[PDB]
Design a protein around this ligand. Structure first.
Ligand SMILES: CCCCCCCCCCCCCCCCCC(=O)OC[C@H](COP(=O)([O-])OCC[N+](C)(C)C)OC(=O)CCCCCCCCCCCCCCCCC
Ligand SMILES: CCCCCCCCCCCCCCCCCC(=O)OC[C@H](COP(=O)([O-])OCC[N+](C)(C)C)OC(=O)CCCCCCCCCCCCCCCCC
Ligand code: SF4
Lengths: 105, 80, 98, 318, 70, 175, 115, 150, 69
């Protein structure tokens, strides 16, 4: 019995916080504002089952924005390869990565 | 009500003083003349960036320069 | 996900196994309950601070607040036992069996 | 070079504690129509050195019934906690520039009672238990008032930073718009540091020594220096909060002279207070702070909430 | 008489003068004669890191002016 | 082993949680949880949460100072156990420390453990932002919009705390 | 980082004094100097007996009032908000709720002592 | 080790902390010594009520048979080094009540006494003289030299 | 703002141009591959920028603001 009285009386109680892509104080965006906007606007009013069956790509992109786990696997793979290539001894870091680089500004 | 007030002022003046301060803090901002001044002072603080807008050619209010007379000024806080 | 997330959730389930296996004292179980809530609070605050969700920043502390609003109740549910029994052992708390 | 700054912060406050013991005995004798210690050195300048060496060549005398873990852990934690909250104090430039130094002071002041509780419970005695219970009641009394005093005084500052507290003094002191809160804050600092008439833990007539009655020399001196660093630092904090001085960025000598003199005068006033009044009962401690202090500070808190809206005087948060 | 406390308390004044002053003097050494750049928010830190990245010596207190550009 | 400061603080968090999860005595459990809360507050400060870390610090200090007063008031035994005065307390403490070091060795070796969900071995600093929030902190406006945006939440929180006061008054009456 | 250095230095200075106070002087202990102090007589029982403490409600309501403080503490930054009327009204409302709890404590005989 | 012996003898003798152990007339005489007229606190002598933080003990009054275990336990709880100063005649040899059935004939039988102060009650100036004699006895101690010889 | 965008693009280009010279003999890998289904720009996480540089830059850049007193 989800008695949605927030729409019956027209009073906003907790719709201003429930979603990451809502109105924020001093207009500060979150880390996945665009992905939230895409996932809401693609999956609006068509039902949860059709939203899961059809809007899976933008939800997957949003979950990858939030968790960033595929980027972690990428960084882990390149870092293990880097550690291995240093350990056998056929890799030398450039001066830019080593620290003496004189950054842009 | 004078006898009751004298009685509580004689017994415990701290409660009378606390309730007087509470009543003043309740009823005075509703009679304050500078509350709207506080409203515009808080609203006029430039926290984030004032990004411009695209032009369709029909706008009489927004300026093209910060020093143009068109647009809102802040003379009221400068004088006060 | 990450590493500190794993540590915090493992702390939560460690404190859960601490609560779910008693050791003959009520207030120690209350401490384990507040530990489970500590893990919950730490996880929620870290999740928000990673995801830059500013407007949800009220939820951790308020969560924390409500926990104290029940935790003292647990303390208020202790001395009453101490007002009937001499101590607060849970093996003495078996009157409700008939 | 932060090590040199840390050492020069932490050693001369211990020397200040020792000479505070000196001038404590001297002045406390002087309002009692007698001289102070003046035999050991010229005007008794060598009394703190003799007191410090004497306590450190005695026998520690650990009790058998005492749980040795918290017994050895309480005084070091007390001295560290009395030492670790000196950093956010602007002097005129603080050691660590924390944006929320008031919250740090509040939390480390809440932690300072735990040494008293662990010293009361670690030693197996009735007097230590009674002292721990009275310390608990003292914390109950003072915390719920002190937090609101600090918030309501801080409401005109605009932020929790202690560095911006020196900016607000540039026109007038905040003791003029918050003199009642100044009285509340002074009584709260009287209550927190466990000084008479709000001692209630190191009682001489009620108990023998209370929380450290089983504490022999060596570990006992740590509580002494912790309490005296606490009172000196608390008076410095009160001076910065209410009687902040004129700061010039080109010459910090003026502000160092001014706040040193003001905090020294406030500590002399504390010494003057501590031996002119009878000791309060601890049942009247929360028959006063929970009864007379709390409604007044609630009224003044809502008044200071509604006052910058009234006069259009909202302070900047930066 | 009473004024005999006035020596000893004066020593405490020195014990309340040596720490804080030293910090200010330390701030006149590690920062190259200026005060320590008080960082309170992200933009102050970004400006200080900008000075660190433009100075070329990896020190923020080495401030270069309009003579640096041509 | 420098940028693993969040990892080290989390390991001390789990160590203190295993330490007080043995439930030896309320004072020692409070000590273990307070060490855990100290390093958790250190985690939150190291992630930029000054206010939240200091708030959980102050709240826990007050709450288990009350808990200390209660265990010294009523719930006390004649000979409290520290950690080794009883067998199962030390057994479960050593057991929890052994599992803690077990997934420590599991996460520092293959850098990807699978306990329910999958977990990586890098520090969380990789997910932290590269952008600057100007002249302000975002959590500060979170707890500032607590009063303006947060109407229903503050109303129900205040009503629940008032109800907690009246309930705690009503429970320990006796008659 | 500097906070960690200050904490470590303070702990090092604290724990060095007790070590100096302990292992430097000569120890000489018998089974009377380690005895508990009861004004020159033997203790009656142990100190682990449950205290019949009388301010249990005062400690619990200290906790509750500290959580009231936790609600009332982010008020200064709310001074920079735009919607000032809701801010002022609900800060006054929360302070009034604190005062209502205190007044109910006062009337229903809670601030006094048992026995 | 001769000069280090000179240091720790100066530290102990200039910060003597007696304990509030009086029993009789002689306790009131001690309180009269602690008055502003004679001012014990000028010599580094401040009263401390706990035996665990006291250096010396001045036994003032009559030690009865109901009091000997209490005095013995209080003396045994004091940390080393400890000195005992007998006072009056009651704590010296029983004095007026030497032949009584319930008075210990001198408190030497219970605790080892370092300094004997004669009087009934001894004058506070004489008591100050006895305390100064105890300080001079502490001054000529030879602990580290004897340790070096052994 | 212009400096920040130019530096971010420069650091990402530096990280991409050295990914080619390290991962060649591995099988079935496409260099510079994104993990997003869309081509829209995203704000890069800190591991993508300084994940190949020294650790001193890591504690001076990630925790540098928090650890500066
Ligand atoms: C910080 C700067 C320096 C501060 C001063 C330092 C030097 C002076 C120190 C003096 C000694 C202090 C320690 C000893 C006393 C300790 C006990 C104590 O303080 O008890 C508190 C005492 C206790 O009172 P009591 O002991 O009399 O209690 C009796 C109570 N009845 C009558 C019910 C039986 O007072 C209070 O609790 C009152 C709180 C302070 C009141 C401040 C009022 C300010 C003005 C308000 C407005 C007035 C105008 C009228 C209303 C107008 C409205 C618009
Ligand atoms: C504010 C800073 C304070 C710093 C600390 C205090 C400053 C002084 C530090 C040194 C004090 C003297 C040594 C410790 C105290 C010894 C007390 C004593 O009487 O010891 C006697 C003892 C000798 O007596 P003993 O060994 O026969 O034992 C006496 C007890 N009976 C007989 C019952 C067993 O001295 C020592 O043990 C020697 C200690 C080291 C002396 C120096 C060695 C060379 C150092 C170079
Ligand atoms: S010696 Fe004399 S003055 Fe002292 S207690 Fe005995 S009778 Fe009294």
């Amino acid at each position: 019995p989800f008695f949605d009285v927030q729409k019956k009386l027209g009073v906003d109680l907790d719709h201003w916080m429930t979603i990451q892509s809502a109105e924020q104080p001093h207009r500060i965006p979150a880390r996945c504002h665009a992905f939230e906007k895409e996932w809401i606007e693609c999956a609006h009013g068509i039902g949860s089952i059709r939203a899961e069956k059809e809007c899976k790509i933008e939800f997957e992109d949003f979950r990858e924005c939030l968790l960033r786990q595929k980027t972690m696997k990428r960084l882990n793979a390149i870092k293990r390869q880097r550690d291995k290539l240093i350990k056998e001894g056929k890799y030398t870091p450039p001066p830019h990565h080593s620290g003496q680089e004189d950054l842009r500004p | 009500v004078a006898a009751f007030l004298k009685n509580v002022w004689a017994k415990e003046p701290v409660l009378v003083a606390s309730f007087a301060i509470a009543g003043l803090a309740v009823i005075l901002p509703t009679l304050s003349p500078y509350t709207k001044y506080s409203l515009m002072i808080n609203r006029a603080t430039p926290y984030n960036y004032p990004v411009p807008l695209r032009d369709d050619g029909n706008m009489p209010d927004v300026p093209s320069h910060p020093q143009d007379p068109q647009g809102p000024s802040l003379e009221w806080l400068k004088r006060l | 996900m990450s590493l500190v997330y794993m540590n915090i959730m493992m702390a939560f389930t460690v404190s859960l196994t601490g609560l779910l296996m008693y050791r003959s004292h009520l207030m120690s179980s209350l401490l384990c309950l507040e530990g489970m809530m500590l893990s919950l609070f730490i996880l929620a605050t870290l999740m928000i601070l990673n995801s830059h969700f500013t407007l949800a920043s009220m939820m951790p502390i308020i969560l924390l607040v409500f926990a104290a609003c029940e935790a003292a109740l647990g303390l208020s549910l202790l001395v009453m036992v101490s007002n009937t029994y001499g101590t607060d052992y849970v093996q003495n708390l078996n009157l409700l069996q008939c | 070079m932060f090590m040199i700054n840390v050492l020069t912060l932490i050693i001369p406050i211990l020397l200040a504690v020792a000479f505070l013991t000196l001038v404590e005995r001297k002045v406390l004798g002087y309002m009692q129509f007698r001289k102070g210690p003046n035999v050991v050195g010229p005007y008794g300048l060598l009394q703190p050195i003799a007191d410090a060496i004497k306590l450190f060549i005695k026998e520690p005398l650990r009790p058998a019934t005492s749980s040795i873990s918290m017994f050895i852990l309480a005084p070091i934690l007390a001295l560290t906690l009395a030492l670790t909250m000196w950093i956010p104090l602007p002097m005129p430039y603080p050691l660590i520039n924390m944006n929320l130094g008031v919250l740090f002071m509040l939390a480390m002041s809440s932690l300072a009672v735990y040494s008293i509780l662990w010293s009361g419970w670690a030693s197996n005695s009735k007097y230590a238990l009674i002292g721990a219970l009275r310390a608990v009641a003292q914390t109950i009394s003072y915390e719920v008032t002190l937090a609101i005093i600090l918030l309501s005084v801080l409401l005109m500052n605009g932020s929790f930073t202690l560095s911006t507290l020196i900016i607000t003094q540039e026109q007038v002191w905040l003791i003029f718009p918050a003199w009642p809160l100044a009285m509340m804050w002074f009584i709260s600092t009287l209550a927190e540091t466990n000084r008479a008439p709000f001692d209630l833990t190191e009682g001489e007539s009620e108990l023998v020594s209370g929380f450290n009655v089983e504490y022999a020399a060596g570990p006992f001196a740590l509580f002494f220096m912790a309490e005296y660093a606490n009172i000196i630092m608390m008076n410095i904090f009160t001076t910065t909060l209410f009687l902040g001085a004129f700061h010039n960025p080109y010459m910090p000598e003026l502000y160092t002279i001014n706040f040193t003199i003001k905090s020294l005068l406030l500590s002399i006033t504390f010494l003057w207070i501590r031996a002119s009044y009878p000791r309060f009962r601890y049942d009247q401690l929360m028959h006063l702070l929970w009864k007379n202090f709390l409604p007044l500070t609630l009224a003044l808190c809502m008044w200071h909430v509604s006052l910058p809206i009234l006069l259009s005087s909202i302070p900047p948060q930066t | 008489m009473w004024f005999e406390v006035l020596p000893g308390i004066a020593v405490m004044g020195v014990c309340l003068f040596i720490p804080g002053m030293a910090t200010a003097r330390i701030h006149r050494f590690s920062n190259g004669g200026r005060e320590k750049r008080v960082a309170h928010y992200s933009y102050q830190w970004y400006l200080m890191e900008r000075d660190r990245r433009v100075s070329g010596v990896n020190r923020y207190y080495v401030s270069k002016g309009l003579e640096n550009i041509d | 082993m420098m940028t693993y400061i969040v990892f080290i603080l989390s390991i001390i968090f789990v160590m203190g949680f295993v330490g007080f999860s043995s439930k030896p005595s309320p004072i020692y459990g409070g000590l273990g949880l307070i060490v855990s809360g100290g390093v958790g507050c250190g985690i939150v400060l190291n992630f930029g949460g000054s206010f939240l870390g200091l708030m959980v610090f102050l709240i826990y200090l007050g709450g288990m100072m009350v808990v200390f007063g209660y265990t010294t008031a009523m719930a006390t035994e004649q000979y409290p156990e520290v950690w080794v005065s009883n067998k199962v307390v030390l057994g479960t403490f050593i057991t929890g420390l052994l599992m803690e070091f077990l997934m420590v060795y599991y996460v520092l070796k293959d850098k990807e453990v699978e306990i329910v969900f999958k977990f990586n071995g890098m520090g969380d600093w990789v997910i932290y932002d590269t952008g600057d929030s100007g002249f302000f902190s975002e959590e500060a406006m979170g707890i500032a919009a607590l009063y303006s945006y947060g109407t229903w939440l503050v109303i129900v929180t205040g009503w629940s705390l008032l109800i907690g006061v009246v309930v705690i008054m009503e429970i320990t009456r006796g008659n | 980082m500097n906070l960690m250095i200050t904490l470590l230095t303070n702990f090092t200075l604290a724990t060095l004094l007790v070590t100096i106070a302990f292992w430097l002087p000569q120890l000489n202990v018998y089974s009377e100097k380690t005895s508990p102090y009861e004004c020159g007589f033997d203790p009656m029982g142990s100190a682990r007996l449950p205290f019949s403490m009388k301010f249990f409600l005062v400690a619990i309501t200290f906790l509750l009032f500290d959580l009231e403080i936790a609600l009332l503490l982010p008020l200064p930054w709310a001074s920079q908000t735009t919607n000032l009327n809701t801010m002022l009204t609900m800060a006054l409302l929360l302070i009034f709720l604190l005062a209502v709890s205190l007044a109910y404590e006062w009337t229903q005989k809670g601030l006094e002592w048992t026995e | 080790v001769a000069k280090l012996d000179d240091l720790i003898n100066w530290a102990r003798r200039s910060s003597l902390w007696p304990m509030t152990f009086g029993l009789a007339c002689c306790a009131v005489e001690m309180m009269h010594m602690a008055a502003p007229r004679y001012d014990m606190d000028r010599f580094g002598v401040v009263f401390r009520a706990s035996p665990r933080q006291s250096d010396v003990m001045i036994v003032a009054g009559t030690l009865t048979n109901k009091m000997a275990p209490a005095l013995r336990k209080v003396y045994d709880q004091m940390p080393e080094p400890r000195y005992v100063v007998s006072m009056g005649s009651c704590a010296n040899g029983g004095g007026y009540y030497h032949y009584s059935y319930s008075v210990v004939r001198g408190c030497d039988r219970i605790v080892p006494v370092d300094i004997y102060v004669p009087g009934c009650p001894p004058t506070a100036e004489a008591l100050l003289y006895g305390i100064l004699q105890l300080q001079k006895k502490i001054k000529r101690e030879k602990r580290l030299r004897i340790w070096y010889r052994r | 703002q212009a400096e920040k965008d130019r530096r971010v693009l420069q650091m990402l280009r530096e990280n991409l141009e050295e990914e080619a010279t390290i991962m060649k003999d591995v099988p079935g890998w496409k260099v510079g591959e994104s993990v997003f289904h869309t081509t829209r720009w995203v704000t890069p996480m800190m591991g993508e920028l300084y994940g190949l540089r020294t650790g001193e830059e890591i504690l001076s850049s990630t925790y540098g603001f928090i650890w500066y007193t």
